[PDB]
Curated annotation (Swiss-Prot), chain B:
Residues 45-120 are annotated as: Factor I module (FIM) 1. Glycans are attached at T46, N104. Component of the membrane attack complex (MAC), a multiprotein complex activated by the complement cascade, which inserts into a target cell membrane and forms a pore, leading to target cell membrane rupture and cell lysis. The MAC is initiated by proteolytic cleavage of C5 into complement C5b in response to the classical, alternative, lectin and GZMK complement pathways. The complement pathways consist in a cascade of proteins that leads to phagocytosis and breakdown of pathogens and signaling that strengthens the adaptive immune system. C7 serves as a membrane anchor. Residues 121-193 are annotated as: Factor I module (FIM) 2. It comes from Homo sapiens. The gene is C7. This is Complement component C7. C-, N- and O-glycosylated. O-glycosylated with core 1 or possibly core 8 glycans. It is linked to Complement component 7 deficiency: A rare defect of the complement classical pathway associated with susceptibility to severe recurrent infections, predominantly by Neisseria gonorrhoeae or Neisseria meningitidis. Belongs to the complement C6/C7/C8/C9 family. It is found in: Secreted; Target cell membrane.
UniProtKB/Swiss-Prot annotation, chain D:
It comes from the Eukaryota. The chain holds residues 166 to 214 of 1676 of the full protein. The gene is C5. This is Complement C5 beta chain. It comes from Homo sapiens.
């Protein structure tokens, strides 16, 4: 599993396409959170988090703030993630079993997934219309869904 | 010798072991057991009852929240921002699921926002409190006995007084043109004794 | 199904006897 | 296959056919040419193999 992310701070990008992407039958992880820290086994460098919000954290998932992993692999160099950075993403759900009682919310961050930076301040960064479009997309997934 | 036999425990009793056996030269039987279990735990765990609710979706033998999008079929109403005085449309189940998730929210009056369910609909798009009439393009409001949806309980003013009622019953009263005014997505104090 | 062997049986044949059985799913020659 | 004996089994003969219990191969075997020897447990030698 490897793909590529969208560019940071993209001007007026299609917010309705985000809803379509999050509505897809392959889509069952979708949340906004801080990237926290990273790991070492190169096909699954773990990418720990700080959960801010969720919209289709789907299959057998529960409430937010869990701070779980969202692993990455070396061939996905176009999907680099920044420690401490706020981010937005969408993709498939976690494989739900491990050495623990569940592997729950250990995200795969696989190929063809959505990824972008989430603005930590938007007033200072020119037009807040890009962050507002993301907020309208998140509101649409939360109100209308799929 | 060469004759065959097939074996089962009695009705509803759970046999453990191989099913059938053959009589060899003149004495052996194979591959049957020395000792056996004709019967077992034929009754499962029953009424485990995980703690669901109208804003909720219990799992793993425990309570849990539901997703606000899964709560989307709730009745439309006016509301206000999580950190501002501005009014906007909302639905009671989506707001309750958000509050179950620890998210902020605020109330509004019955005319404070452009809620889609605020008046009677047409055929082909009716809310859970109504349905299309036979050979007709208009929707019709149902009676309170037509409560096929689960529904929240909510606070509303009727006949000049505050009273608690089901979300589907308040929706039927709203759709049929009865004089009402919603006051909160929580129920009233009126049931206190 | 796919056995390697079967029909492992002993019978009295009173000058004629007939047995009935399913050949297995194995698409191969069975030597009896 | 290393020539070490691993079991014995007996049955009575009624028919001129003698069907023995279905010896399971031990849980970690030596591969190769195991041997079955058979003798009457009576006043006879008559080895078959």
């Amino acid at each position: 599993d490897c793909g590529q992310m969208q560019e940071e701070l993209d001007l007026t990008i299609s917010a309705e396409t985000r809803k379509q992407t999050a509505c897809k039958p392959e889509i069952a992880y979708a949340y906004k959170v801080s990237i926290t820290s990273i790991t070492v086994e190169n096909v699954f460098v773990k990418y720990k988090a700080t959960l801010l919000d969720i919209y289709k954290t789907g299959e057998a998932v529960a409430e937010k703030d869990s701070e779980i992993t969202f692993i990455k692999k070396v061939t996905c160099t176009n999907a680099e993630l920044v420690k401490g950075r706020q981010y937005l993403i969408m993709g498939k759900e976690a494989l739900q079993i491990k050495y623990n009682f569940s592997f729950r919310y250990i995200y795969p961050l696989d190929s063809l997934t959505w990824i972008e930076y989430w603005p930590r301040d938007t007033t200072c960064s020119s037009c807040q219309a890009f962050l507002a479009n993301l907020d309208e997309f998140a509101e649409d997934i939360f109100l209308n869904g799929c | 010798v060469g004759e065959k036999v097939t074996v089962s425990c009695s009705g509803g009793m759970s046999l453990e072991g191989p099913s059938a056996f053959l009589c060899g030269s003149s004495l052996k039987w194979s591959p049957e057991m020395k000792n056996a279990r004709c019967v077992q735990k034929e009754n499962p765990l029953t009424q485990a009852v995980p703690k669901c609710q109208r804003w909720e979706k219990l799992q793993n033998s425990r309570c849990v929240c539901k997703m606000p999008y899964e709560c989307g079929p709730s009745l439309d109403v006016c509301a206000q921002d999580e950190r501002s005085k501005r009014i906007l449309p909302l639905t009671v189940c989506k707001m309750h699921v958000l509050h179950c998730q620890g998210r902020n929210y605020t109330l509004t009056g019955r005319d404070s926002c452009t809620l889609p369910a605020s008046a009677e609909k047409a055929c082909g798009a009716c809310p859970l409190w109504g349905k299309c009439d036979a050979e007709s393009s208009k929707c019709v409001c149902r009676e309170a006995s037509e409560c096929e949806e689960e529904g929240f309980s909510i606070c509303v003013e009727v006949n000049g007084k505050e009273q608690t009622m089901s979300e589907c019953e308040a929706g039927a009263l709203r759709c049929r043109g009865q004089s009402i005014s919603v006051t909160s997505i929580r129920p009233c104090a009126a049931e206190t004794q | 199904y796919f056995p390697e062997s079967w029909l492992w049986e002993v019978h009295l044949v009173p000058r004629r006897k007939q047995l009935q059985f399913a050949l297995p799913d194995s698409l191969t020659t069975w030597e009896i | 296959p290393e020539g070490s004996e691993v079991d014995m089994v007996e049955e009575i003969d009624h028919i001129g056919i003698i069907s023995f219990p279905d010896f399971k191969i031990p849980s970690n075997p030596r591969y190769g040419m195991w041997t079955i020897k058979a003798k009457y447990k009576e006043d006879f030698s008559t080895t078959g193999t």
